Design a protein around this ligand. Structure first.
Ligand SMILES: Nc1ccn([C@H]2C[C@H](O)[C@@H](COP(=O)(O)OP(=O)(O)O)O2)c(=O)n1
Ligand SMILES: Nc1ccn([C@H]2C[C@H](O)[C@@H](COP(=O)(O)OP(=O)(O)O)O2)c(=O)n1
Ligand SMILES: Nc1ccn([C@H]2C[C@H](O)[C@@H](COP(=O)(O)OP(=O)(O)O)O2)c(=O)n1
Ligand SMILES: Nc1ccn([C@H]2C[C@H](O)[C@@H](COP(=O)(O)OP(=O)(O)O)O2)c(=O)n1
Ligand SMILES: Nc1ccn([C@H]2C[C@H](O)[C@@H](COP(=O)(O)OP(=O)(O)O)O2)c(=O)n1
Ligand SMILES: Nc1ccn([C@H]2C[C@H](O)[C@@H](COP(=O)(O)OP(=O)(O)O)O2)c(=O)n1
Ligand SMILES: [Mg+2]
Ligand SMILES: [Mg+2]
Ligand SMILES: [Mg+2]
Ligand SMILES: [Mg+2]
Ligand SMILES: [Mg+2]
Ligand SMILES: [Mg+2]
Lengths: 151, 151, 151, 151, 151, 151
């Protein structure tokens, strides 16, 4: 009944370049179930927490201001192996390492403008989802076509 | 810098059939700016207020229950003439009267399953937005290609 | 529950120009149910029966030999009012009079090369369906998302 | 000139999820020639022959009843090396191991719901083509753009 | 053999918004034959001539500077009724009067940013094509699929 | 403001099969900037120079005749790492080795009919561009969304 969930974000360059629908469409088409979504400009402090494990890296300060400089689409998607499979659908961290067919492969060039975020582990997803959504903002429901996706 | 706003919601049949990205895509491709978005299963009572001008019609009670029976994507879109243009993009109330190229025209058959809602006038839009969004949930921002959409 | 049915054929120019998938895609997206499909080079005699009401016309003989000069995709699609709605989805008899968004409007130019056929009435459909399919070749099944297409 | 042929089936979850057009679209775009197609709910016995080499496996019985529980699109596609290339276009047996850009990679999640079938060898194809189609149901024709696909 | 031709331009907002391929794709898909194409930033003087019949209108001076302020895709397309049919595919002069499914209907809001140009008559097309292409820059050739488009 | 350039040409089979918009679309969606474009049927001798490093190989004479036998779209695309990334987007020299998601992977079958050309290195690109474009035919301009592609 209840399956694995991950945190997915359309970054500000994704919003600005008009790729929200294209990204959602790819996840709907794959078979994953939307559990949460909101549209916000988050605080620099929230992003500092979101990327807390990278607080060490040189790019960290600039990253968090950039990721809070504009609206992002915050999402929670549900389905078997969704944390890892979402990463595959995105490509690699660097669009230059990303295959055609992937989101970053089809749409971006630079690492600092790679339009999308996804949790790198189940445990990360739990933190990120909790950081971005209140429990009551998460919708539990049953997709009608579930039995043609999961046996 | 602030333009006309309208309320667009993807209905529970739209969500169920994996048409969220597809609908958002069409509004992005048209040139409109996403101003608000959230994902909820709303109360039957919320839907009663949304459709208050229809409380007399026979189909009303069922409509409000169906429109609250599963999650919906609630959106606010912004741009010159967006209220009327969104209606044009949806088609008619009856999918049977909707032309190919329109959202209802391309994707559905029955009036009771017409996948999308849109405000029918500026005054309706203001009411509907205030009902589904909190003021702080409407995002103020500048799209970079705006000068290629508006002269 | 068996609903209205109509006969749709991908014409030889449709097959030759690689539009079979695109055409089927449009009917699936619309919500209609594929009830029958086969792939044949039909006899000149079958086509002469199929186009019997136009046997008077000067274009008739060339028409009947052309529609039997190559493989066609024979289909039966099912859904409420599928007969009339399919016509709307196709456009007009002449591509020149078909709107963008419709199949003939989007994909072709001449009346003699208008890639698709559809029944013009419930009774034309019954006769044509009967002409191209044996009863057992019409498949009875339930699409799972039916309750999100029909109320 | 008749070239290599392979057997492709849209599985019941493919039919149910509205992916028939999308799948055919991919093979037409690739350059392959549709040589055969029919739409059936095949017998459990036919499927037991079709999956004969896996009759040992624990998943086999459920597999054979599931693949005969609903309509499938049976196809024969023709083109050089069509057998192996179709497999590449499908992805791997498990959707989880299939890359984005492939059919199972783009559209599904579980191995038991992997929407499409294709022959794994020239000889598997000959046997399967023979199993699902009567000889006369395989159509001989020349696609006009052949000289732009094959040198 | 030789069919009607018209002048089509992707305006600077079309180039800037990444819609070149989308527009060409629509004309290739319709069946028209590409006879000429070049990518240039034209002089204000050339545009003054291009729009010479509107030299009277208040918007004329600004129009010609805007249409020469950046690269445009200049094209010549060939096919029956292509002058008039190209106009239909574009929509109306005002995107607000344009239907969904049309280029302007799907993609624009304002009259001053309506991304595409097309000749309004056969006689205009002759002038515009001649203005934008040297005779040797026009390619006469035969599309292989012509006999499936024109009988 | 001036980035790496590469030469991309849509081959005569690409033109013939209506893949021009489709290819241009993929380069626009990726983030690259169109720097040059023209549409020609080039001389056999021009193609001999284009492929000069291959004059020894057996397939060379036929290749140069085929590559000059119909019109081609000649293009110059600009962006960080565009030379290598364009190759990635095309796939391998043999479509048989090209993955789904790539241009050759999605659209063709044989090595002699592989619809697109791309420079294999910066030095090859410089030579090829100088051969197919005059200096003044390369357009200098600023894309508005560049700051969403490059940080
Ligand atoms: N040199 C770098 C590396 C990463 N970034 C950005 C872009 C990355 O998506 C975020 C987070 O990097 P991370 O190591 O977590 O990689 P993923 O996004 O999870 O694939 O930081 C950057 O701006 N410059
Ligand atoms: N005969 C009818 C008419 C409307 N409905 C439903 C479906 C409609 O989309 C909603 C809203 O009715 P309304 O008149 O506001 O029409 P729109 O949705 O704005 O196009 O009511 C119905 O179920 N049966
Ligand atoms: N003047 C004409 C009229 C019809 N045809 C062809 C093209 C049409 O699709 C078929 C059938 O004509 P019909 O009147 O039944 O029109 P529909 O196909 O139902 O749209 O014949 C023609 O070639 N020339
Ligand atoms: N462990 C497994 C292996 C296969 N199946 C299903 C799914 C597969 O598509 C069919 C056939 O398996 P097969 O080994 O022939 O793999 P392919 O379909 O040819 O990719 O059986 C399963 O449900 N569980
Ligand atoms: N009020 C207006 C009217 C037209 N324009 C622009 C936009 C139009 O495409 C061009 C030419 O107008 P025209 O009357 O020839 O109409 P078409 O483009 O041929 O449909 O001028 C404008 O910028 N402001
Ligand atoms: N065995 C071969 C190898 C190459 N060709 C053709 C087709 C190739 O695209 C061109 C160019 O050869 P090249 O080694 O430069 O390969 P690329 O096109 O850059 O991928 O030659 C051929 O016809 N037969
Ligand atoms: Mg991370
Ligand atoms: Mg109303
Ligand atoms: Mg008729
Ligand atoms: Mg096998
Ligand atoms: Mg004009
Ligand atoms: Mg080379």
């Amino acid at each position: 009944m209840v399956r694995e969930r991950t945190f997915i974000a359309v970054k500000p360059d994704g919003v600005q370049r008009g790729l929200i629908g294209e990204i959602i469409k790819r996840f709907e088409a794959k078979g994953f179930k939307l559990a949460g979504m909101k549209y916000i400009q988050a605080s620099e402090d929230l992003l500092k927490q979101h990327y807390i494990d990278l607080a060490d890296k040189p790019f960290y300060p600039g990253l968090c201001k950039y990721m809070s400089s504009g609206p992002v689409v915050a999402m929670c998607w549900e389905g078997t192996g969704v944390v890892k499979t979402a990463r595959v659908m995105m490509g690699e961290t660097r669009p230059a390492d990303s295959k055609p067919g992937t989101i970053r492969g089809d749409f971006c060039i630079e690492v600092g403008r790679n339009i999308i975020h996804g949790s790198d582990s189940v445990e990360s997803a739990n933190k990120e989802i909790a950081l971005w959504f209140k429990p009551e903002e998460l919708v539990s429901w049953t997709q009608t076509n579930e039995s043609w996706i999961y046996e």
